[PDB]
Amino acid sequence: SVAHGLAWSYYIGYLRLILPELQARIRTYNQHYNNLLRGAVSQRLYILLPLDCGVPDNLSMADPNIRFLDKLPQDRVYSNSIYELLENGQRAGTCVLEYATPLQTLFAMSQYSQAGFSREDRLEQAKLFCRTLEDILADAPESQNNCRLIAYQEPADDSSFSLSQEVLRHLRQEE
Amino acid sequence: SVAHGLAWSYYIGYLRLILPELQARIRTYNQHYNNLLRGAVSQRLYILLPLDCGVPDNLSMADPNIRFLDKLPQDRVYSNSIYELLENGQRAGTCVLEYATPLQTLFAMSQYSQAGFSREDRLEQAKLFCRTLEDILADAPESQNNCRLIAYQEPADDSSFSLSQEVLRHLRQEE
Numbered sequence: 001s002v003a004h005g006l007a008w009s010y011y012i013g014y015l016r017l018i019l020p021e022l023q024a025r026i027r028t029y030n031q032h033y034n035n036l037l038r039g040a041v042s043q044r045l046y047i048l049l050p051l052d053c054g055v056p057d058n059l060s061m062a063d064p065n066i067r068f069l070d071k072l073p074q075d076r077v078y079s080n081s082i083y084e085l086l087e088n089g090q091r092a093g094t095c096v097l098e099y100a101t102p103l104q105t106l107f108a109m110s111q112y113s114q115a116g117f118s119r120e121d122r123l124e125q126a127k128l129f130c131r132t133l134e135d136i137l138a139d140a141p142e143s144q145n146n147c148r149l150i151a152y153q154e155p156a157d158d159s160s161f162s163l164s165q166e167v168l169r170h171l172r173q174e175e
Numbered sequence: 176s177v178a179h180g181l182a183w184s185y186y187i188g189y190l191r192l193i194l195p196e197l198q199a200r201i202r203t204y205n206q207h208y209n210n211l212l213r214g215a216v217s218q219r220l221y222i223l224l225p226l227d228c229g230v231p232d233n234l235s236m237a238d239p240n241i242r243f244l245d246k247l248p249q250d251r252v253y254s255n256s257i258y259e260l261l262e263n264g265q266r267a268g269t270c271v272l273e274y275a276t277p278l279q280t281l282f283a284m285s286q287y288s289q290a291g292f293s294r295e296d297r298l299e300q301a302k303l304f305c306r307t308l309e310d311i312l313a314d315a316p317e318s319q320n321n322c323r324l325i326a327y328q329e330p331a332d333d334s335s336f337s338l339s340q341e342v343l344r345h346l347r348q349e350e
């Protein structure tokens with residue numbers, strides 16, 4: 001199962017490096033980067049995990065209610081982005097949000113003939129990736145409390161699905 | 176097992192992106208420095224796969240007979256390095272050389288208590304990583320032709336080990 005290595009390297013090579021400093025980066029941003037009406041950025045890295053492995057280049061193109069706000073300021077450099085979440089036209093939250101990049105590997109594999117990797121195989125591995133990553137984070141209490149995995153399967157009636165709503169459900173659980 | 180996910184992401188997320196442009200970058204370098212260089216930088220990416228997963232801070236300290244020459248010049252930027260290989264005190268080869276980065280993941284896991292990942296596990300996974308990567312490369316002859324895997328273990332009897340000789344043995348099968 002490719003998901004095992006994908007989850008482990010995502011943790012070892014990214015999450016365990018970025019998460020320990022995230023709380024401070026967000027606090028600093030909230031306290032030091034002045035824009036009159038900007039809302040407080042929520043703590044935690046919110047990670048989108050579509051089980052279909054469909055990762056857009058433009059996160060806001062997946063949902064007009066997810067609006068880019070700013071880059072989270074920074075020994076290496078990590079690009080993280082802050083977004084406002086809208087609900088019925090109003091600002092309902094502000095958070096640090098991104099797709100789980102290893103899902104792009106699963107998607108690319110499914111499009112690569114020689115991989116012998118079907119859409120069915122991909123869905124199995126996407127589920128396994130989420131499970132494996134959850135188990136890793138459960139054993140790392142610090143990293144666990146600094147991120148939230150948002151795993152979802154999209155309904156056939158896409159008019160009944162809102163990516164912003166999915167993020168808001170998780171964000172509001174912390175409140 | 177983590178090995179095959181590590182191999183697939185290394186291919187999908189790095190090798191398949193860098194390899195198609197490598198020959199042109201090396202050719203350009205060879206043209207630019209044709210007056211200085213007595214013998215041309217070899218084509219192909221030579222990837223070091225120490226099965227002990229020991230990836231030192233830089234090639235340089237692994238072998239006095241491997242010496243840094245220059246960065247290979249030139250969306251996503253890639254850092255690759257050119258080294259000279261010495262034999263009998265003379266420059267015997269010049270090539271683009273680098274450790275397989277996913278071996279770092281395996282090393283880190285073995286040092287991470289919660290992974291339950293022993294030295295025995297690590298070695299087995301390193302071997303599986305190499306086998307899987309070789310198999311992936313064999314189905315992408317284009318990529319296969321553009322790189323060479325150099326897998327090795329250091330002697331158990333603690334006789335001397337020459338990394339340069341490993342690389343030269345491979346480099347000389349092309350010529």
Ligand SMILES: Nc1nc2c(ncn2[C@@H]2O[C@@H]3COP(=O)(O)O[C@H]4[C@@H](O)[C@H](n5cnc6c(=O)[nH]c(N)nc65)O[C@@H]4COP(=O)(O)O[C@H]3[C@H]2O)c(=O)[nH]1
Pocket residue numbers: 009010012013014077078079098101102105184185187188189252253254273275276277280
């Ligand atoms: N959102 C986010 N995600 C990140 C970041 N850094 C790493 N990741 C995610 O974590 C995966 C594993 O990173 P890795 O352990 O460094 O494992 C890497 C590394 O071993 C190797 N690799 C990637 N880029 C390079 C490179 O420029 N040079 C070399 N030598 N190896 C590379 O291939 C493996 C897989 O690369 P990826 O497919 O990109 O897969 C990445 C990617 O999905 C980040 O700054 N932000």
Ligand SMILES: [Ca+2]
Pocket residue numbers: 155156157158
């Ligand atoms: Ca639909």
